[PDB]
Amino acid sequence: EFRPEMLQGKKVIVTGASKGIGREMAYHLAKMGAHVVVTARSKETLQKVVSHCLELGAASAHYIAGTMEDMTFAEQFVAQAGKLMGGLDMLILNHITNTSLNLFHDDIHHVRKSMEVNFLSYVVLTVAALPMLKQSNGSIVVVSSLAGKVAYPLVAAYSASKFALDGFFSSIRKEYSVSRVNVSITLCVLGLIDTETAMKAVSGIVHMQAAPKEECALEIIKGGALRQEEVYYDSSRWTTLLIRNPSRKILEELYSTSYNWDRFI
Amino acid sequence: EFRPEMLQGKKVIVTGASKGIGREMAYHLAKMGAHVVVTARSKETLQKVVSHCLELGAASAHYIAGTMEDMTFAEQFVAQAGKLMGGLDMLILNHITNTSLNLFHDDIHHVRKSMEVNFLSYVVLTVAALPMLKQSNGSIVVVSSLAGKVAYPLVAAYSASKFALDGFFSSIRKEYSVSRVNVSITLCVLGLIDTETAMKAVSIVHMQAAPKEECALEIIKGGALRQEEVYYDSSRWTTLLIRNPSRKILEELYSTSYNWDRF
Ligand SMILES: NC(=O)C1=CN([C@@H]2O[C@H](COP(=O)(O)OP(=O)(O)OC[C@H]3O[C@@H](n4cnc5c(N)ncnc54)[C@H](OP(=O)(O)O)[C@@H]3O)[C@@H](O)[C@H]2O)C=CC1
Ligand SMILES: NC(=O)C1=CN([C@@H]2O[C@H](COP(=O)(O)OP(=O)(O)OC[C@H]3O[C@@H](n4cnc5c(N)ncnc54)[C@H](OP(=O)(O)O)[C@@H]3O)[C@@H](O)[C@H]2O)C=CC1
Ligand SMILES: CC(C)(C)c1c(C(=O)N[C@H]2[C@@H]3C[C@H]4C[C@@H](C3)C[C@@H]2C4)cnn1-c1ccc(C(=O)O)cc1
Numbered sequence: 001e002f003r004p005e006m007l008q009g010k011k012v013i014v015t016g017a018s019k020g021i022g023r024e025m026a027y028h029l030a031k032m033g034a035h036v037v038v039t040a041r042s043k044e045t046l047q048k049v050v051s052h053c054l055e056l057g058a059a060s061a062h063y064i065a066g067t068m069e070d071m072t073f074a075e076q077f078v079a080q081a082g083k084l085m086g087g088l089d090m091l092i093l094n095h096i097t098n099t100s101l102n103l104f105h106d107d108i109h110h111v112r113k114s115m116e117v118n119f120l121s122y123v124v125l126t127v128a129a130l131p132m133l134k135q136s137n138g139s140i141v142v143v144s145s146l147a148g149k150v151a152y153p154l155v156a157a158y159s160a161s162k163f164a165l166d167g168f169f170s171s172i173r174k175e176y177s178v179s180r181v182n183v184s185i186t187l188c189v190l191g192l193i194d195t196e197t198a199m200k201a202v203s204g205i206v207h208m209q210a211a212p213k214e215e216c217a218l219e220i221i222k223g224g225a226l227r228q229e230e231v232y233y234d235s236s237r238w239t240t241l242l243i244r245n246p247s248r249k250i251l252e253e254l255y256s257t258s259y260n261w262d263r264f265i
Numbered sequence: 266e267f268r269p270e271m272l273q274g275k276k277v278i279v280t281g282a283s284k285g286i287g288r289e290m291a292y293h294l295a296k297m298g299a300h301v302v303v304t305a306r307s308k309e310t311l312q313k314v315v316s317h318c319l320e321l322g323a324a325s326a327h328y329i330a331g332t333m334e335d336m337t338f339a340e341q342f343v344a345q346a347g348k349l350m351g352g353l354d355m356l357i358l359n360h361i362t363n364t365s366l367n368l369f370h371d372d373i374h375h376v377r378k379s380m381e382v383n384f385l386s387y388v389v390l391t392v393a394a395l396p397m398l399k400q401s402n403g404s405i406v407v408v409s410s411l412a413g414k415v416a417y418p419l420v421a422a423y424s425a426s427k428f429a430l431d432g433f434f435s436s437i438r439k440e441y442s443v444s445r446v447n448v449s450i451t452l453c454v455l456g457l458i459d460t461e462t463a464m465k466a467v468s469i470v471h472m473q474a475a476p477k478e479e480c481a482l483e484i485i486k487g488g489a490l491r492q493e494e495v496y497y498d499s500s501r502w503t504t505l506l507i508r509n510p511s512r513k514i515l516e517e518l519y520s521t522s523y524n525w526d527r528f
């Protein structure tokens with residue numbers, strides 16, 4: 001179904017691309033011959049990722065360094081990236097604030113910082129990217145987790161922010177259908193993935209088994225390119241089968257049928 | 266299974282109690298003879314509510330007016346309410362920032378205000394109530410929506426905040442089990458309900474609303490019975506289809522596979 005030629009010459013933004021899954025996606029897009037604008041806080045690591053993207057064969061690879069804590073950076077970054085590539089075809093929202101496995105006690109500051117970085121910044125980015133994506137019949141790719149579909153201990157603030165992405169983007173997708181906005185939204189529900197961040201977070205939990213970041217990153221690109229609503233990627237075949245909720249799809253399809261919202265458009 | 270005597274003499278907080286579902290819950294708790302501390306921004310409507318609660322037979326009814334936009338109010342309110350009742354048995358988190366059905370365009374301010382009011386304030390109130398509920402083996406009751414389990418158009422910021430409550434509280438419930446915290450968490454997944462707010466928002470041809478009075482009772486029954494989730498819609502189709510057993514199987518496998526005792 002998917003072809004690598006589908007990404008050739010496309011204008012793609014990847015957030016949290018200095019390392020992990022974001023970096024792997026940037027490299028994948030580069031091998032496919034895409035124009036890429038990557039971001040993270042570290043200018044040096046980004047410069048190393050951009051250098052490799054050009055070697056891989058990216059049509060054009062650029063970086064803009066800043067913190068997604070700053071909503072003015074987030075808004076401006078989209079404009080600057082859009083000018084560099086002369087448009088936008090895909091927006092890959094992937095960055096997250098630093099998190100570790102820990103019991104929740106009193107950390108409102110972490111809960112809010114998770115909400116601002118992992119969620120609000122995504123909305124600010126989308127808002128700023130939507131005119132370019134509308135004129136290119138584009139794609140938003142939102143990187144979530146199993147922890148953003150199912151409840152796990154030790155990642156309460158993280159789970160709260162990934163659950164919010166589902167609520168927001170799945171709702172805005174329903175709206176795009178009514179308001180006939182031909183911009184696709186892909187929510188990526190990932191299991192544990194073997195990035196240095198995750199592997200350092202999980203050190204010692206021997207029974208916990210990570211999936212390849214390389215294939216994971218490809219599966220995210222394939223999903224958005226094919227305009228799929230949801231992408232699932234875990235190492236367990238048990239999880240992949242059980243993660244899907246058809247009961248939700250039924251309730252959503254019934255409301256889509258039962259109501260006409262044309263007197264809002 | 267449930268008995269009204271279960272709430273007699275209990276120390277309950279109800280947020281967003283000047284109107285709608287919150288008001289109805291306060292009155293229900295008053296009929297059952299509980300000690301109640303109610304909150305919303307309007308002092309006068311709250312005073313009329315605290316006066317009806319005493320007539321209905323509440324053991325003690327009090328009000329503290331303020332905005333849950335203010336996290337310091339939220340934190341302090343719990344301490345003050347706790348002092349007025351000399352403890353805390355149940356925390357009923359119900360308030361929300363004003364929302365209407367509309368397409369999302371550029372409203373970051375609404376998305377953030379919805380997250381501060383509908384979500385963060387709940388975490389602030391929970392943190393502040395926890396020692397008191399711990400010493401009383403208490404209950405947190407979180408009022409969510411179908412829109413906090415399933416995706417609907419025109420309530421993006423609202424859906425995002427109700428989805429966050431699920432993520433946060435369901436995760437902390439897993440933690441309370443590991444850390445052996447005997448404080449229950451009830452998430453209430455409500456369908457459309459006939460409150461003036463809802464009926465004004467829907468003035469949506471075919472939408473059936475459910476009775477606010479029964480709804481409010483069903484929320485009390487659920488928390489009192491320490492149920493993890495409460496479902497209340499007018500459709501029998503919705504109530505059957507709203508449950509996610511796939512996620513409970515996944516949760517039970519992780520509960521089994523891992524031991525987190527060193528946390
Ligand atoms: N790996 C896993 O096990 C799982 C990953 N996921 C999701 O995958 C995505 C990527 O994760 P992963 O590849 O492991 O992460 P990494 O930690 O390896 O990469 C995170 C990236 O985000 C950047 N970043 C961190 N903080 C900020 C900030 N405040 N502002 C801007 N950029 C920031 C980092 O660079 P810098 O610090 O230099 O700014 C880096 O480029 C996330 O959305 C995560 O939730 C989902 C489930 C599991
Ligand atoms: N009604 C329905 O159809 C549905 C309701 N729900 C949920 O049920 C709960 C109650 O809804 P409902 O009774 O219909 O709503 P209402 O609008 O009737 O009542 C909301 C309450 O919150 C208070 N409140 C509003 N803004 C603030 C604020 N900034 N700070 C503090 N308090 C505030 C209000 O008091 P005041 O203005 O005086 O401060 C009021 O008492 C909510 O959690 C809602 O999401 C879920 C699904 C459907
Ligand atoms: C680690 C956990 C639970 C949270 C998880 C995730 C996730 O979102 N992990 C985050 C990543 C970024 C941050 C650092 C690390 C890695 C921890 C978390 C914060 C994705 N799958 N998954 C998971 C792992 C194992 C199993 C299982 O064996 O049953 C099921 C699901």
Ligand SMILES: CC(C)(C)c1c(C(=O)N[C@H]2[C@@H]3C[C@H]4C[C@@H](C3)C[C@@H]2C4)cnn1-c1ccc(C(=O)O)cc1
Nearest residue numbers: 255364410411412417420455456457462463466472
């Ligand atoms: C109104 C809507 C969709 C969002 C909804 C809710 C909800 O969250 N209602 C709140 C009310 C108060 C505030 C203003 C309004 C009304 C929106 C919300 C905030 C709870 N069920 N439900 C709903 C209604 C009908 C159907 C159906 O016929 O298939 C399915 C679900």
Ligand SMILES: [Cl-]
Nearest residue numbers: 019020195196
């Ligand atoms: Cl890595």
Ligand SMILES: [Cl-]
Nearest residue numbers: 284285460461
């Ligand atoms: Cl009302």
